[PDB]
Design a protein around this ligand. Sequence first.
Ligand SMILES: Cc1c2[nH]c(c1CCC(=O)O)Cc1[nH]c(c(CCC(=O)O)c1C)Cc1[nH]c(c(CCC(=O)O)c1C)Cc1[nH]c(c(C)c1CCC(=O)O)C2
Ligand SMILES: Cc1c2[nH]c(c1CCC(=O)O)Cc1[nH]c(c(CCC(=O)O)c1C)Cc1[nH]c(c(CCC(=O)O)c1C)Cc1[nH]c(c(C)c1CCC(=O)O)C2
Lengths: 356, 356
Amino acid sequence: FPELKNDTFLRAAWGEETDYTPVWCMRQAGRYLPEFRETRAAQDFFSTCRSPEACCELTLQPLRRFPLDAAIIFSDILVVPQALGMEVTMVPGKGPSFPEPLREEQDLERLRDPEVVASELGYVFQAITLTRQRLAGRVPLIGFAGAPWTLMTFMVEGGGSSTMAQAKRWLYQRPQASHQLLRILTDALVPYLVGQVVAGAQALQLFESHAGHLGPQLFNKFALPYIRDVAKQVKARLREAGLAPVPMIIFAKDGHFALEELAQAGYEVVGLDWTVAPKKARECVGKTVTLQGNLDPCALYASEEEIGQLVKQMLDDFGPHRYIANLGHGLYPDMDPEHVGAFVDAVHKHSRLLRQ
Amino acid sequence: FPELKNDTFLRAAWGEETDYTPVWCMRQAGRYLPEFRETRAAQDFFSTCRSPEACCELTLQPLRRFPLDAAIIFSDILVVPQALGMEVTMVPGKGPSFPEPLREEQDLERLRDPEVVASELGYVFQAITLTRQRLAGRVPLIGFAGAPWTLMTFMVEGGGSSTMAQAKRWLYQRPQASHQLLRILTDALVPYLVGQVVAGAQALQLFESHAGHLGPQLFNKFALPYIRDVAKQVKARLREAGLAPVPMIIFAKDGHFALEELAQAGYEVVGLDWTVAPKKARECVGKTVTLQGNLDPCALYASEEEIGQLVKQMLDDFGPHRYIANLGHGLYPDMDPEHVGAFVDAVHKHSRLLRQ
Ligand SMILES: Cc1c2[nH]c(c1CCC(=O)O)Cc1[nH]c(c(CCC(=O)O)c1C)Cc1[nH]c(c(CCC(=O)O)c1C)Cc1[nH]c(c(C)c1CCC(=O)O)C2
Ligand SMILES: Cc1c2[nH]c(c1CCC(=O)O)Cc1[nH]c(c(CCC(=O)O)c1C)Cc1[nH]c(c(CCC(=O)O)c1C)Cc1[nH]c(c(C)c1CCC(=O)O)C2
């Protein structure tokens, strides 16, 4: 691959000092961009995900508008449950659905052996290689997947939920079958994430987007062990294959209660939602992980001047060390690309002023 | 399409006698026109190129001011390297840039298969069809592209250069990789140029704008073969598709040294810069190609009366046969539209006096 030119994001992820704070945005390839909507109108969602050229194009679009310090491959976390043998749709304007969710223990029999999942996800690896080549070393490329618990919630609920009552009912009433499913997911995720790195990914983020539905006791029993396993096994396999391990980011949205445990879970970077005060997060995680985040995505509805001031305040709280800027979740479809631009420029501007 | 009403430019290109000398100007759709600047202020440069209506409008603007004998579609030669997978910007007042130029052989791996480029340039074909329809047969519409060597220089240098030292270093140190790249470009250009004709173009010009950096030995080894290939293959494909081949113009700026070879390269018309005395050019190319050019664009800074006299002298040197008037390069942004008008009127006036 082409030599990396701007490695600020990677240096920051490993905790090294940098000249400015690197920034990227979750869902930077997203519907808030008119050009994203146009490229997407061509195919259906999961068909877009299966076209390396389409994925590459969507990945590059934000970088043409903004000097973001990382790209993230266009894909979706739900490709893993799909590759395990579940059928999944993107309903017109009503999000992901599994018309036949997992509801009893016997339903696990329908899933593929987790060891064959990576072979089913070749299309993602093709997209990663192509995007890495086309990026031509501009900035690092992040690969990603959903965390076991979060993927379990989609598989059991059949979509989004305000309570995760069915998935949590599994945890309390079917603890053994839950662990079995969480292990299947872990065993699928590890080779998939390794394959993403083999294909060209230079960092990995694991999205535990539905952490907040668990309190600490269930999180520690059912989510944390598998989060830890994913990091340990991915690093081991990469070492063994003669490759360099990449920085790994754990993002547990609404996971305020788990920050101390997440800082010990074998990830270089702990991603934060907007509800956690940066200084409180720093006390929780300690001095040797990098934090990522955490501006309220809705702050981007404010004026460009206001966004600059909110960014300044955020960066004052995080300080110059061991920090990668981002929002506290993904960009929303109704947001203004110019305000995303203002966010990026302000992180760059204020982080330089904070140093010198 | 509407039937062509004024075909003088085409008759002259094929070498037929005409009642007056037809004239057009390189960069006639350009910044010297206040109305060009206004229409352009709407979008960024490459976004203008992707709007058929914007391209059509820019193409027609000069024709509303001046009785030019041809239109040339508004586009840019750099759409080809873009469609091959390189990222390219139009920097505010500092021209084209590729932030990640090709610098080693392995960088060729990032490019698209040349056979898929035409599909990426549909927007240009749409602009051509629309402009041909809106022109309503007034005058012929010229399509165009950059020549392989010249496109290679942009791809390797990452922009303009006073020496082409990096691209020439490729020719001397990486001859094989250079030929590989020049072949990729040729194989992309042929289907693109054919598609321009399919879409409505009635003539084609290939811009070898950076010929002059090569002497004769390198030009014959690395530029000429691909110039020849482009013409041979475009004509073959058009024949085979049941379409009429169009006149093709090769313009090698600062290519004094290559005129004899260019006259044998399969182009109806050889375009000249202002440094070549017309009578010397005529001896070089012989009696069976048409010459195009060649007034110093800077001559348009002279008074309207002076421009008339310079034009008279130019036309005396070229003579009435096998000649299409133009400047020796494109119009510059600070030139006066009224002086462009004087140029057009003088060619028409003096060429009629030269015949009768
Ligand atoms: C709406 C939706 C989709 N997929 C999903 C949803 C949410 C469903 C729910 O919560 O009930 C499922 C999903 N996809 C992704 C996540 C993790 C993000 C999180 O919730 O923390 C989740 C939970 C990451 C992603 N989803 C996507 C990426 C690729 C990276 C990028 O787009 O920049 C990632 C990491 C791409 C994607 N995927 C989808 C769209 C429309 C897009 C474009 C971005 C947008 O406009 O929202 C469909
Ligand atoms: C400044 C620039 C542009 N594009 C380019 C440059 C020069 C870069 C360099 O030499 O370092 C690259 C380019 N574009 C074109 C050429 C070939 C002309 C030549 O050098 O012989 C080249 C070398 C043709 C063109 N470039 C364009 C056309 C369309 C036809 C027309 O505009 O009449 C062609 C054939 C349009 C264009 N393209 C651009 C502008 C501003 C315009 C409007 C015309 C003007 O004011 O200069 C941007």
